[PDB]
Amino acid sequence: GSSGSSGMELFTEAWAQAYCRKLNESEAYRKAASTWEGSLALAVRPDPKAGFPKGVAVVLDLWHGACRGAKAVEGEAEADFVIEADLATWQEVLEGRLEPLSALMRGLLELKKGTIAALAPYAQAAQELVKVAREVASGPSSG
């Protein structure tokens, strides 16, 4: 059992670092993406409704399934795989109703860096990533 919802700011250093450290615990995940070797960044389209006229970019350096380091940068970030999309589309995935890869494949998201041909082998590993992603989300601060 678990709950969350409520709150405007979601892509914050806290959530980034927390979601990065929470994975290292998910043995199952590490074992799954124990082959992956790179970094991932979740960019969000610039919008006032959230307070980001330039957009936010959360890094997620994943090392063989084991997190390496996360950092939140508003604007121009840096990662082997950068995906930018509407905050609304990004939420769905986190809510568990949508998927990270299925979204970018359906035409919802869009990878600016890296390539999709690299997600071929890492198409399932996502299920593990998102899984933990939710665990973190619960309620860091009222706001």
β 56-63/37-44 pair status: antiparallel
How crowded is residue 124: how many other Cβ atoms within 10 Å of its Cβ?
10
β 66-69/81-85 pair status: unpaired
Torsion angle, alpha carbons of 112, 117, 120, 122, to 10: -50
* Main-chain phi, psi angles of 115, to 5 degrees: -155, 160
- 122's CB contacts (< 8 A; 6+ apart) are 33, 36
The structure's method of determination equals NMR
Q: How far apart are CA 77 and CA 45, in angstroms?
A: 13
Beta-bridge mates of residue 37: 63
DSSP line for 13-52: HHHHHHHHHHHHH-HHHHHHTSS-EEEEEEEE--BGGGTB
Q: Yes or no: say if 137 and 15 are a contact pair by the CB < 8 Å rule.
A: yes
Q: How far apart are CA 44 and CA 57, in angstroms?
A: 6
Q: Yes or no: say if 34 and 65 are a contact pair by the CB < 8 Å rule.
A: yes
Q: Yes or no: say if 84 and 112 are a contact pair by the CB < 8 Å rule.
A: yes
Helix (H, G, I), strand (E, B), or coil: what is residue 126?
Answer: helix
Q: How far apart are CA 27 and CA 34, in angstroms?
A: 10
For the chain, what is the total number of helices (H) and then of strands (E)? 5, 5
Q: Yes or no: say if 59 and 70 are a contact pair by the CB < 8 Å rule.
A: yes
Fold of 1-143: Nonspecific Lipid-transfer Protein; Chain A (3.30.1050)
- 127's CB contacts (< 8 A; 6+ apart) are none
Closest-CA residue to 40 (of 134, 133, 107): 133
Residue whose structure tokens are 């959360």: 58
Q: How far apart are CA 49 and CA 11, in angstroms?
A: 14
Q: How far apart are CA 31 and CA 4, in angstroms?
A: 27
Sequence-ordered strand ranges (E) for the chain = 37-44, 56-63, 66-69, 72-73, 81-85
Closest-CA residue to 135 (of 7, 35, 25): 25
